[PDB]
Amino acid sequence: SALTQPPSASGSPGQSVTISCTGTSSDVGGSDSVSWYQQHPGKAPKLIIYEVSQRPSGVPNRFSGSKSGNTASLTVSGLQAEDDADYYCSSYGGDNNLFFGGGTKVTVLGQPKAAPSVTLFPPSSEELQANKATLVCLISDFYPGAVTVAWKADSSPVKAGVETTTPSKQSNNKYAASSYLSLTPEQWKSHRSYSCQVTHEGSTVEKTVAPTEC
Amino acid sequence: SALTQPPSASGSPGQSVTISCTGTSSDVGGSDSVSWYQQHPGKAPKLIIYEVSQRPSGVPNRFSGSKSGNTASLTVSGLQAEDDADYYCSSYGGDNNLFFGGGTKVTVLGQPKAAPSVTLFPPSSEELQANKATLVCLISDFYPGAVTVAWKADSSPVKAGVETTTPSKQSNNKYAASSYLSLTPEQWKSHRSYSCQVTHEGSTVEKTVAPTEC
Ligand SMILES: C[C@@H]1c2ccc(OC[C@H](C)c3ccccc3)cc2C(=O)N1CCOC(=O)NCc1cccc(-c2c[nH]cn2)c1
C-alpha cells in the first residue's frame, strides 16, 4: 500500500491503543482528508473518522483521530470487546486520487500473549530429486493470531513465490501458520542463504538456511 | 443505514454475473460517488470501481460498474476462480456520510478439483541442535479446501503431538495447509521413518522421511 500502517496492535480491556498511518506530503500531509474505517472480518466496514478528527454520528468518543506531518493516528481509549477488529486509513491525493493503508489488526487480548516458535526447513531430499526446492517457515504457538512474514534471498527481499497461510487456532488455543517459498533448484543452490523474518506484536524473529553438501 | 446488496450471487467459469446496490436519492441516487470493493476472506479489500464506473490501474476490464436511479450495479464478465470473493458497494451521502452495503458473496461454481501437493520435511539441523525435532507436512494446491491428515511412526499410527492448520486459499486460488508433528530428537532417531498421509476427496497421498545419513 502507498500508505503505511502497522500490521497489528493489541491491548487489554480498558487500555488505550494508538495506530499510525504514514504517507507523504502529497497525501496524508497535504490536506485534512484522512479517514479511518473499522471492519469486523466478514462484515461490512464502517467509517469511524473523517477529515482527520471527525466522528460520524453513533461513533463513541473513545475513538479520536489526529495528524502530525505525514503521519495520522487513531487512538482507541478504554478498549472494549467490540473494538477487536481491522482498521484501515485513507487519504485523498494530489490528483484527487485516493490512497489506502494496508490495515491494522487490533486485538483486545483474550488470553496471554505468546511469541511464535519459528522453524525454517530447507528443501527436502525428495522434492529436490523432483526438481523442486520449496522452503517452509513453520510458525506456531503464538497469540494474538496476527503475524507478518518476509523472505530474503541473501540480503535482498523476495516477493515472488511467497505464500503464507491464514493463522488458525490449534488444540492448545494458540495460533499456527506456515510460510513457504517455492524455489527452483537453481535458485536455492545459487544463493548464499535464504531467510524467514517473522514479525509478531511489533517484534521480529529471523531464521536462515543455506545449502549443504548432504 | 446500510445500502442493499443481495447476500449471494453466482456464475460459472466464463459466464457473467451482475450484482446490485440499492440506496436512496441522497446517497447512491444523489451523486456519482459509488465505489465497489473486492475482498477475499481474511485479506485486505481492493477497490475495483470508483465514481460508478472507473477502474483503478491493474483492475481487469472484466469488471464494469453502472448506475440507474437509486441502484448501482457491478458486472463481472468472463468469471475466473479469483473472482470468488465478497463484494461491497459504498456511496457518499450528505453530511460527510459514507454508506456501505452489506456485501455480496459471489461464488464461482464448479471450480476444478485438484489433488494436493504434499512435501514432508524432516527436522532441520538447527532445531536438532536446540533439542527439538519437529516435522512439517506441507499441503498445497488442493481444491476444494478440506483435507484430513494421519501420521505414522514406522508403520504404526501416531496418536499424539499432531496439529494441522485450517486450510486457507492462496494466490493460485487453491488451498494450502500444514500439519506438524512435534517429536523429541530421541523419538526421531529411534524409528526407521515417519510418514504423513493426506486424504483429500477420498484419495490419499503418503510421504515418508527417515533420519539422514550425513
Ligand atoms: C490494500 C489497499 C486497501 C485497503 C483498504 C481498502 O478499503 C477499505 C474500506 C474501508 C473497506 C471496503 C470494503 C471492505 C472493507 C473495508 C481498499 C484498499 C485498496 O484498494 N488497497 C490497495 C492499494 O490501492 C489503493 O490504495 N487504491 C485506491 C485507489 C486507486 C485508484 C483510484 C482511486 C480513487 C480515485 N478516486 C476515488 N478513488 C483509489
Bond prior to A45 in cis (omega within 30° of 0): no
Distance between B213 CA and the closest CA of chain A, angstroms? 8
Cα–Cα dist B54/B176, whole Å: 34
Q: How far apart are CA B100 and CA B106, in angstroms?
A: 17
Answer yes or no: CATH 2.60.34.10 is held by domain A117-209. Answer: no
Give A 121-150 residues with CB within 8 A of chain B.
121-122, 124-127, 132, 134, 136, 138, 140
Comparing CA positions, the residue from B172, B177, B179 lying closest to residue B194 is B179
Distances (CA, A) of B194 to A158, A177, B130, B187, B189: 32, 22, 20, 10, 10
- Tell whether B193 is within 8 A of chain A (Cβ): no
Pick from B119, B129, B147, B164 the residue to mutate for testing the A interface (most A CBs within 10 Å): B119
CB atoms within 10 A of CB B179: 25
3-state secondary structure of A69: coil
Buried b (16+ CB within 10 A) or exposed e, B180-190: bbbbebeebee
Q: In this complex, do A177 and B177 lie within 8 Å of one another by their Cβ atoms?
A: no
Q: Say yes or no: do domains A8-108 and A117-209 share a fold.
A: yes
Do A116 and A207 touch, CB atoms closer than 8 A?
no
Resolution (A): 1.9
Q: Which residues line ligand 1 (CB under 6 A)?
A: A 1-2, 37, 39, 45, 88, 97-100, 102-103; B 37, 39, 44-47, 50, 56, 88
- Site from A55, A141, A166 to mutate, B interface, most B CB atoms within 10 angstroms: A166
Residues A110, A79: Cα–Cα separation, whole Å: 12
Q: Is A190 helix (H, G, I), strand (E, B) or coil?
A: helix
- Partnered with residue A74 across adjacent β-strands are A19, A65
CB contact under 8 A, B163 and A180: no
Q: Residue B48: its chain A contacts at CB < 8 A?
A: none
Closest A-chain CA to B57: A97
A84 Cα–ligand 1 center, Å:
21
Asked if B97 and A56 come within 8 Å (Cβ–Cβ), the reply is yes
Contact A48, A56 (CB under 8 A): yes
Phi, psi of B188 (to 5 degrees): -65, -45
Taking the C-alpha atoms of residue A94 and residue B43, their distance in angstroms, rounded to an integer, is 28
Using the beta-carbon criterion (under 8 Å), do B177 and A165 form an inter-chain contact? Answer: yes
Q: Where are the domains positioned within chain A?
A: 8-108, 117-209
Task: Report which of B60, B31, B32 is spatially closest to residue B48, judged by C-alpha positions.
Answer: B60
Cell digits of residue A45: 466496514
Could you write out the three-class secondary structure of chain B? CCEECCCEEEECCCCCEEEEEECCCCCCCCCCCEEEEEECCCCCCEEEEECCCECCCCCCCCEEEEEECCEEEEEECCCCHHHCEEEEEEEECCCCCEEEECCEEEEECCCCCECCEEEEECCCHHHHHCCCCCEEEEEEEEECCCCEEEEEECCEECCCCEEECCCEECCCCCEEEEEEECCCHHHHHHCCCEEEEEEECCEEEEEEECCCCC
Question: Yes or no: is domain A8-108 CATH 2.60.40.10?
Answer: yes
Give the distance from residue A69's alpha carbon to the nearest chain B alpha carbon, in angstroms.
Answer: 24
Mutate to test the pocket of ligand 1, among B47, B51, B88, B89 (most ligand atoms within 8 A of CB): B47
